[PDB]
Amino acid sequence: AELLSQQWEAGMSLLMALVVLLIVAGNVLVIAAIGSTQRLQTLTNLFITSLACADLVVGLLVVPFGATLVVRGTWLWGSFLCELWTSLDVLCVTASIETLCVIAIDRYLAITSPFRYQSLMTRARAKVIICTVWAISALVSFLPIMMHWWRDEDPQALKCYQDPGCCDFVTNRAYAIASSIISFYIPLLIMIFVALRVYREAKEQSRVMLMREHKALKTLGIIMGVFTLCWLPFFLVNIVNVFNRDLVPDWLFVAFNWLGYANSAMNPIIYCRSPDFRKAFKRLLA
Ligand SMILES: CC(C)CCC[C@@H](C)[C@H]1CC[C@H]2[C@@H]3CC=C4C[C@@H](OC(=O)CCC(=O)O)CC[C@]4(C)[C@H]3CC[C@]12C
Ligand SMILES: CC(C)CCC[C@@H](C)[C@H]1CC[C@H]2[C@@H]3CC=C4C[C@@H](OC(=O)CCC(=O)O)CC[C@]4(C)[C@H]3CC[C@]12C
Ligand SMILES: CCCCCCCCCC(=O)N(CCO)C[C@@H](O)[C@@H](O)[C@@H](O)[C@@H](O)CO
Ligand SMILES: CCCCCCCCCC(=O)N(CCO)C[C@@H](O)[C@@H](O)[C@@H](O)[C@@H](O)CO
Ligand SMILES: CCCCCCCCCC(=O)N(CCO)C[C@@H](O)[C@@H](O)[C@@H](O)[C@@H](O)CO
Ligand SMILES: CC(C)(C)NC[C@H](O)c1ccc(O)c(CO)c1
Ligand code: NA
């Protein structure tokens, strides 16, 4: 009884601390490696840094908070922090997929208009892109949440909003679909379309130089495909719930959300296909 709890509490607190550590280590590495290598300060990696910041925010803030909830069984941090926690969660996924769109666009341009691309893309402009992405993302995630557009009238819903120990995120059907379409599905579709255009013009192509490039593009390809596998199952279930809560077991809907959080750990590992990243990872770790 009370032993079964202690075992679970402490073993979970461990797995959580491990994930926290892996995300936070992995992404600090990426930021520092780009931060301390002129070789690796390309325009494209500015977008990678932005992406790794998003994952960093999942490691320091999203996952710790969510861990305390999973381990201890309730929300211990009050109303305001619960909403702000939810905000940051939605914020991160949105910035992540929007940054992936920028990256696929950056690559499409650089590959079919290398001349137009050169005279257009500068450092001051890649900064503007990155902030515009974070602004759009914060707009679409904070405001509806802090304005309670996500709330429902249900008895269950109000049971939970009054209770300070509840941080369930029970939303209405409108917010569920709007949020999914605006935060995930639309950028997901843009990023697919632009990723297959990029793959067309990739095949339709000094040989050593082109192999090294296509290695980098596949890396980016993997980045995207894995982000899509980690999140697509959750946003599919998010939708289907609105029409039928009986079609998918609750535990799996929770699982799928964690799979999402887990994606924050994967990019630094995947960037180990790069010799340049790998040399900077070792040099840094001292
Ligand atoms: C409290 C929550 C909402 C988190 C707040 C996150 C933002 C304030 C962070 C996340 C991504 C960051 C950006 C990620 C990458 C860059 C690239 C970087 O480009 C450079 O001009 C210097 C890099 C170089 O040339 O070596 C400047 C900071 C900037 C715009 C960062 C500005 C601040 C951002 C938008
Ligand atoms: C809210 C959801 C439904 C929209 C998801 C779309 C975004 C992932 C992408 C699509 C096109 C992208 C835009 C493509 C081009 C630009 C111009 C870009 O470059 C500059 O403005 C620099 C020029 C300067 O120096 O002033 C700023 C970001 C922005 C709006 C990008 C922001 C992110 C956008 C809107
Ligand atoms: C959750 C994130 C949400 C971001 C919050 C919105 C802020 C809007 C962006 C912004 O304030 N800037 C654009 C950022 O590019 C200002 C910068 O231009 C600033 O640094 C300037 O003072 C100098 O560039 C000029 O000397
Ligand atoms: C970018 C995110 C944008 C989401 C914005 C959607 C806001 C829609 C407003 C809304 O739907 N409600 C008001 C909340 O402001 C709640 C109602 O849906 C609900 O309370 C009842 O009418 C139920 O009985 C369902 O029919
Ligand atoms: C509210 C009750 C929720 C209780 C269940 C919480 C599950 C904890 C989530 C977690 O950390 N993982 C399970 C994820 O389902 C492990 C992941 O790190 C794992 O998926 C990845 O390591 C691999 O997929 C890739 O190597
Ligand atoms: C329920 C909990 C843990 C806050 N998950 C939120 C989930 O990660 C999520 C992320 C992004 C989104 O756009 C939505 C929209 O329903 C939900
Ligand atoms: Na509550």
Curated annotation (Swiss-Prot):
It is found in: Cell membrane; Early endosome. Its main location: membrane. It is a multi-pass membrane protein. GO terms for biological process: adenylate cyclase-activating adrenergic receptor signaling pathway; norepinephrine-epinephrine-mediated vasodilation involved in regulation of systemic arterial blood pressure; positive regulation of heart contraction; positive regulation of MAPK cascade; regulation of circadian sleep/wake cycle, sleep. Residues 72-83, 148-173, 244-248 are extracellular. GO terms for molecular function: beta1-adrenergic receptor activity; identical protein binding. Cyanopindolol binds at residues 89, 179, 257. A lipid is attached at residue 286 (S-palmitoyl cysteine). Keywords: Cell membrane, Disulfide bond, Endosome, G-protein coupled receptor, Glycoprotein, Lipoprotein, Membrane, Palmitate, Phosphoprotein, Receptor, Transducer, Transmembrane, Transmembrane helix. Beta-adrenergic receptors mediate the catecholamine-induced activation of adenylate cyclase through the action of G proteins. This receptor binds epinephrine and norepinephrine with approximately equal affinity. In dorsal pons neurons, involved in the regulation of sleep/wake behaviors. This is Beta-1 adrenergic receptor. It comes from Meleagris gallopavo (Wild turkey). The lineage of its organism: Eukaryota, Metazoa, Chordata, Craniata, Vertebrata.
